[PDB]
Design a protein around this ligand. Sequence first.
Ligand SMILES: *C(=O)C[C@@H]1O[C@@H](C)[C@@H](O)[C@@H](O)[C@@H]1O
Ligand SMILES: *C(=O)C[C@@H]1O[C@@H](C)[C@@H](O)[C@@H](O)[C@@H]1O
Ligand SMILES: [Ca+2]
Ligand SMILES: [Ca+2]
Ligand SMILES: [Ca+2]
Ligand SMILES: [Ca+2]
Lengths: 6, 114, 114
Amino acid sequence: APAKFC
Amino acid sequence: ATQGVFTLPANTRFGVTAFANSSGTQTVNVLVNNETAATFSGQSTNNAVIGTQVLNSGSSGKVQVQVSVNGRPSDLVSAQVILTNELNFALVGSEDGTDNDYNDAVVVINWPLG
Amino acid sequence: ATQGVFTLPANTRFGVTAFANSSGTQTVNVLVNNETAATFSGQSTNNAVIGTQVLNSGSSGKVQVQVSVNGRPSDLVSAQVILTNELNFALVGSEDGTDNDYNDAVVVINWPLG
Ligand SMILES: *C(=O)C[C@@H]1O[C@@H](C)[C@@H](O)[C@@H](O)[C@@H]1O
Ligand SMILES: *C(=O)C[C@@H]1O[C@@H](C)[C@@H](O)[C@@H](O)[C@@H]1O
Ligand SMILES: [Ca+2]
Ligand SMILES: [Ca+2]
Ligand SMILES: [Ca+2]
Ligand SMILES: [Ca+2]
């Protein structure tokens, strides 16, 4: 469950 | 030009509602007099309401809408429209990607209430 | 003039949401090609969402919004506004009484979706 920011 | 920034009449209640149409999780911030007054968050590709609330425009009447996805500001388009000199709509669209449908978070502000 | 009637691009999905700001119970009918396709009901003086749904504009693309309060047709005002030649809003306010704030039921239609 790939989580990302910016 | 600057987009998503609206001058409301002072000390007036307004509704703000945010819709989603993107596989990206939308973060909407509503600022009153430069202070974050409300924050909505959600993901939907079927126009789901990801937040709704009543705010007061305060002494300055300045309301600003900001949209970001995973902490990346979306590009904004906006306008205000007034019907029979009474009913106010402030409208925001945003784009978090490349396809330019500008609906990824749609934000609607309306006043007066009651 | 006629109000609350909108020609959309054919066979297009669109959002429709209704707000309430009256002490009267608001009834909102949305017709697609002159046939009822959605109906919302609710009472609020706090801009509560009384309904939200996605519809298809069908082959004609004709969409009509009606508002009643306890069987009584409300006076409508409407307009459509398009942002960056892509994001569409169809806006309706209505008056059920005498103060003319025209927010008694506020209906917002937006497209494209997705
Ligand atoms: C990917 O996140 C693109 C994002 O979601 C698509 C399904 C579509 O709604 C597009 O407009 C949006 O930018
Ligand atoms: C009733 O007198 C009028 C009805 O309800 C009020 C609370 C207010 O919202 C008014 O605008 C509406 O027409
Ligand atoms: Ca997009
Ligand atoms: Ca989209
Ligand atoms: Ca009224
Ligand atoms: Ca009212």
